[PDB]
Design an enzyme around this catalytic site. Structure first.
Site, PDB file in Angstrom:
ATOM      1  N   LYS A 126       0.815  -1.216   0.000  1.00  0.00           N
ATOM      2  CA  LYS A 126       0.000   0.000   0.000  1.00  0.00           C
ATOM      3  C   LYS A 126       0.853   1.272   0.000  1.00  0.00           C
ATOM      4  CE  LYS A 126      -4.231  -2.218   1.593  1.00  0.00           C
ATOM      5  NZ  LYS A 126      -3.580  -3.543   1.802  1.00  0.00           N
ATOM      6  N   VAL A 127       1.756   1.319  -0.974  1.00  0.00           N
ATOM      7  CA  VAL A 127       2.771   2.367  -1.035  1.00  0.00           C
ATOM      8  C   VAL A 127       2.097   3.741  -1.065  1.00  0.00           C
ATOM      9  CG1 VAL A 127       4.752   3.213  -2.300  1.00  0.00           C
ATOM     10  CG2 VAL A 127       4.244   0.753  -2.258  1.00  0.00           C
ATOM     11  N   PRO A 130       6.969  10.894  -4.249  1.00  0.00           N
ATOM     12  CA  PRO A 130       7.562  10.169  -5.378  1.00  0.00           C
ATOM     13  C   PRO A 130       8.936   9.538  -5.126  1.00  0.00           C
ATOM     14  CG  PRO A 130       6.378  12.077  -6.191  1.00  0.00           C
ATOM     15  CD  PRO A 130       6.350  12.165  -4.667  1.00  0.00           C
TER      16      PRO A 130
END
EC number: 4.1.1.23
Lengths: 207, 208
Positions: free
Chosen positions: B68-69, B73
């Site tokens: 569930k990153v 970025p």
């Protein structure tokens, strides 16, 4: 405030390097200045969770696990338990998945005598899409969950004042400033410098 | 569809046990039925990321890392790279942090020849607060990012229908059903069953 953590010199090191050798070296070099280190998944996934015990046994620093926990309650419980068992003093949790997901983390922290930080907002460009609009309500949710520790946005000081307004003057707030936040998080300015020790010293001066 | 992953028997095992001994035993027992296993943080944090290589070398299953990153970025890139280096075939990524955070994951997946699954919605009670209202827009964001793999909600089949509508008939959709999703994720019914093999076989029978 007596009931919240004392971060040495109000400066938390974001130790974002991914190899154990580099990470330990820098942290040791700045231990005279910093007693609180934030570590994330790239380091622990690459080197193992045992690295948390190493930071603490070698340097006696507080460890904040920046894991941005963002699962369902049962899974959040297990992530927190594993992270605290590994020695983390605190864990950073997303609010977007809602109150029950946050409470699951608070429950384990209560059981184990550790701390939960609620992440209210982020400052990368994509944060505008959903996170920015939810931030105030997430902060209020934290207040209504008895949350005492918060992570706020990196940029826009006026967002920090809004956050401080919602959470009150007592709660502990950290941000990547010190008019509103209790401690500042610093990464590259320290761990990429040729002399980490000197960089930390210098930042503390202006502080 | 030829261009998306083939999950044996349309059944993905959610291997949510936290001790290596138990995890490996169950997975082996069902390998005749399942070729795709989803692993999450409780197992990998407790036992190490090396466990991914073990699942693959022992059983030759595909591994989906349910991480569930949900970071910025640059950090997403590093999490994906570490996870793929450890051998994961795919990684599950939140959409609520926005398009750049998802694209960072897609970039690494492109570099390394691996897959990103976009999580569009969750079904636990707290999901009503922010996730439910963002789900359709997150799915649409995925489409506008070229995302080919999605994870949908566990409950409310009519939500699965809406998701399938947004992402099209081509995209790969998995959910915890098979009228809309390409594969179903199953956990407890198998790994907390008297004999996992029989449970898997039985579930597969229900699926025609």
């Amino acid at each position: 405030r007596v009931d919240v953590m004392d971060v040495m010199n109000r400066l938390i090191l974001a130790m974002d390097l991914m190899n154990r050798d580099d990470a330990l070296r820098v942290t040791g070099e700045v231990r005279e200045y910093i007693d609180t280190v934030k570590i994330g998944y790239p380091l622990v996934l690459s080197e193992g969770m045992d690295i948390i015990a190493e930071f603490r046994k070698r340097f006696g620093c507080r460890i904040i696990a920046d894991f941005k926990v963002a699962d369902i309650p049962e899974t959040n419980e297990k992530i927190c338990r594993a992270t605290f068992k590994a020695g983390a003093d605190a864990i950073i949790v997303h609010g977007f998945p809602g109150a029950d997901s946050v409470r699951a983390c608070l429950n384990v922290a209560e059981e184990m005598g550790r701390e939960v930080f609620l992440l209210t907002e982020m400052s990368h460009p994509g944060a505008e899409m959903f996170i920015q609009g939810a931030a105030d309500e997430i902060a209020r949710m934290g207040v209504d969950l008895g949350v005492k520790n918060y992570v706020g946005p990196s940029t826009r000081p006026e967002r920090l004042s809004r956050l401080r307004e919602i959470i009150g003057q007592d709660s502990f707030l950290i941000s990547p400033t010190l008019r509103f936040a209790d401690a500042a998080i610093v990464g590259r300015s320290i761990y990429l410098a040729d002399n980490p020790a000197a960089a930390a010293a210098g930042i503390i001066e202006s502080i």
